[PDB]
Enzyme design. Sequence first.
Site, PDB file in Angstrom:
ATOM      1  N   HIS A   1       0.866  -1.238   0.015  1.00 44.03           N
ATOM      2  CA  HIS A   1      -0.035   0.063  -0.182  1.00 44.03           C
ATOM      3  C   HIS A   1       0.694   1.346   0.111  1.00 44.03           C
ATOM      4  CE1 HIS A   1      -3.893  -2.208   0.910  1.00 44.03           C
ATOM      5  NE2 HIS A   1      -3.054  -3.105   1.217  1.00 44.03           N
TER       6      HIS A   1
ATOM      7  N   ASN B   1       3.863   1.497  -1.328  1.00 41.99           N
ATOM      8  CA  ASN B   1       4.557   1.504  -2.635  1.00 41.99           C
ATOM      9  C   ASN B   1       3.594   2.255  -3.697  1.00 41.99           C
ATOM     10  OD1 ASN B   1       6.714   0.295  -1.699  1.00 41.99           O
ATOM     11  ND2 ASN B   1       6.526  -1.618  -2.869  1.00 41.99           N
TER      12      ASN B   1
ATOM     13  N   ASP C   1      -5.594   5.682   0.631  1.00 42.85           N
ATOM     14  CA  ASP C   1      -5.868   4.343   0.279  1.00 42.85           C
ATOM     15  C   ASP C   1      -7.489   4.194   0.715  1.00 42.85           C
ATOM     16  OD1 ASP C   1      -6.103   1.302   0.910  1.00 42.85           O
ATOM     17  OD2 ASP C   1      -3.977   1.542   0.544  1.00 42.85           O
TER      18      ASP C   1
ATOM     19  N   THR D   1      -5.597   0.080  -4.551  1.00 42.36           N
ATOM     20  CA  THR D   1      -4.425  -0.845  -4.479  1.00 42.36           C
ATOM     21  C   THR D   1      -4.482  -2.293  -5.166  1.00 42.36           C
ATOM     22  OG1 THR D   1      -4.385  -1.527  -2.253  1.00 42.36           O
ATOM     23  CG2 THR D   1      -3.034   0.353  -2.776  1.00 42.36           C
TER      24      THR D   1
ATOM     25  N   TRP E   1      -1.075  -7.701  -6.142  1.00 38.50           N
ATOM     26  CA  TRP E   1      -1.309  -6.843  -7.309  1.00 38.50           C
ATOM     27  C   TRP E   1      -0.258  -5.934  -7.715  1.00 38.50           C
ATOM     28  CZ3 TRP E   1      -4.019  -7.058 -11.258  1.00 38.50           C
ATOM     29  CH2 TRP E   1      -4.166  -5.988 -12.307  1.00 38.50           C
TER      30      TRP E   1
ATOM     31  N   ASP F   1      -7.342 -11.100  -2.751  1.00 39.78           N
ATOM     32  CA  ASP F   1      -7.558 -10.836  -4.461  1.00 39.78           C
ATOM     33  C   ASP F   1      -6.332 -11.759  -5.109  1.00 39.78           C
ATOM     34  OD1 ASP F   1      -5.348  -9.046  -3.044  1.00 39.78           O
ATOM     35  OD2 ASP F   1      -5.195  -8.258  -5.002  1.00 39.78           O
TER      36      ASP F   1
HETATM   37  O1  LIG Z   1      12.198  -8.610  -2.285  1.00 38.22           O
HETATM   38  C1  LIG Z   1      11.052  -7.902  -2.546  1.00 38.22           C
HETATM   39  C2  LIG Z   1       9.934  -8.437  -2.389  1.00 38.22           C
HETATM   40  C3  LIG Z   1       8.710  -7.549  -2.875  1.00 38.22           C
HETATM   41  N1  LIG Z   1       9.077  -6.390  -3.088  1.00 38.22           N
HETATM   42  C4  LIG Z   1       7.980  -5.234  -3.311  1.00 38.22           C
HETATM   43  O2  LIG Z   1       6.957  -5.639  -2.239  1.00 38.22           O
HETATM   44  C5  LIG Z   1       5.727  -5.457  -3.105  1.00 38.22           C
HETATM   45  C6  LIG Z   1       4.746  -6.307  -2.638  1.00 38.22           C
HETATM   46  O3  LIG Z   1       3.579  -6.047  -3.034  1.00 38.22           O
HETATM   47  P1  LIG Z   1       2.504  -6.999  -3.659  1.00 38.22           P
HETATM   48  O4  LIG Z   1       1.189  -6.453  -3.809  1.00 38.22           O
HETATM   49  O5  LIG Z   1       2.920  -7.697  -4.708  1.00 38.22           O
HETATM   50  O6  LIG Z   1       1.986  -8.064  -2.316  1.00 38.22           O
HETATM   51  P2  LIG Z   1       1.888  -7.975  -0.941  1.00 38.22           P
HETATM   52  O7  LIG Z   1       3.121  -7.878  -0.009  1.00 38.22           O
HETATM   53  O8  LIG Z   1       0.973  -6.689  -0.553  1.00 38.22           O
HETATM   54  O9  LIG Z   1       1.003  -9.382  -0.271  1.00 38.22           O
HETATM   55  C7  LIG Z   1       5.729  -4.823  -4.476  1.00 38.22           C
HETATM   56  O10 LIG Z   1       5.708  -3.947  -4.842  1.00 38.22           O
HETATM   57  C8  LIG Z   1       7.333  -5.747  -4.731  1.00 38.22           C
HETATM   58  O11 LIG Z   1       7.989  -5.110  -5.701  1.00 38.22           O
HETATM   59  C9  LIG Z   1      10.324  -5.996  -3.045  1.00 38.22           C
HETATM   60  O12 LIG Z   1      10.661  -4.594  -3.342  1.00 38.22           O
HETATM   61  N2  LIG Z   1      11.411  -6.640  -2.889  1.00 38.22           N
END
Ligand SMILES: O=c1ccn([C@@H]2O[C@H](COP(=O)(O)OP(=O)(O)O)[C@@H](O)[C@H]2O)c(=O)[nH]1
EC number: 2.4.1.-
Length: 443
Positions: free
Chosen positions: A14, A16, A113, A135, A344, A365
Amino acid sequence: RRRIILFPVPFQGHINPILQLANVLYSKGFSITIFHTNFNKPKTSNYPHFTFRFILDNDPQDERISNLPTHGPLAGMRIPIINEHGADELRRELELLMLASEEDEEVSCLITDALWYFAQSVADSLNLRRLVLMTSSLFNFHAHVSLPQFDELGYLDPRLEEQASGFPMLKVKDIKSAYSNWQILKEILGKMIKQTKASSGVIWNSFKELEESELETVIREIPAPSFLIPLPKHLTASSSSLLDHDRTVFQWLDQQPPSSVLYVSFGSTSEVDEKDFLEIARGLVDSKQSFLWVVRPGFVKGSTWVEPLPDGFLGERGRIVKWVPQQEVLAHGAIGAFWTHSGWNSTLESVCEGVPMIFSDFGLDQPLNARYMSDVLKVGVYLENGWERGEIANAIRRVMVDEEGEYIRQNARVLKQKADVSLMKGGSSYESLESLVSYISSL
Ligand SMILES: O=c1ccn([C@@H]2O[C@H](COP(=O)(O)OP(=O)(O)O)[C@@H](O)[C@H]2O)c(=O)[nH]1
């Protein structure tokens, strides 16, 4: 001069997109204030051009949020708690800032958000327009507003392989997994939707050519204007990383042939049993492909990092690290595929870098993204029946090496090209951003 206040949800997926959006808007001439919790705060020194104001969990912390766990599935309890009790503080902080405003400076809007549904009535009470950042995908929202129909059919109450009533795109199995927890999340979901519909505008991290089938639902259900901007095509989220990057991976990637490496990562909050973690490792080894595996410390339940793994078990072809600049890795020429949990941001990043995928999921999701990517766009293969080393190895080889998977690799290349074209003059995302900037400037 016009200022925009943005208020993210304090989790990696969120923070990011909202700081990518903040940078895009900064590039269009807006000044930027970020309201943020102290919890899971990003590195403010990475953003000398933003003003940060920390709110809601300042000293002394509330009995409601004090000693709440900073990690794990329970850290998210902060979200409903802040929605239920943070209105008075958020209004005070917005007023303080609106008061301190320079004479030649106006606060144009607040962007939150969508999960901060409590912020709508706060903004209303200040005659301040609120826009919402989604998001998650348009397809996921389409599923959200179909919940009543899903409930009538009994999908939500625990024919799994069967096509869903209004989603030939989906199997009943997908909907059950997506809404497995629903007495718990039903209340959050309804309020988020209601206050999103009541907002002054909705920004979607997507692009028209990615989710064309879903646009009419958004236009029909949300009276406020919607804008689709694929944020990873504007910039990576490297500066908002909550963990230190292991950049030693790029020297290693530089020793690999083009398209020869499987990148593996299951996001920022997922966790797995010790049993499933070991099966994944055997599937990776069994694939005979080179792989770079991000295992977030805490990913394996009961271990600090990767204790259960025999020394040298990954052997010659594999590397395990704690955290990387993910989109930058996906852009590296060595990467041939991405085994994702279907979050996502990760899915959109991979699309924007033209990397085909293997999908697992951890509910919410994620199963819907995996189904849509694998069966509608056809840019990946969905491991929809758990973790088994045989099926894992076959899916990796199908995407990365098999001739039978060429169409998936080609689809991923073409979809990246569509994202690129969408940012050119006359493209859908270009016109969305142009419209968004002029709309905010009219407030
Ligand atoms: O080693 C890593 C693993 C993940 N990410 C970032 O962490 C975020 C994960 O968001 P996502 O929506 O994919 O999954 P969530 O963590 O919310 O389950 C993304 O922007 C990835 O690029 C990163 O920067 N480095």
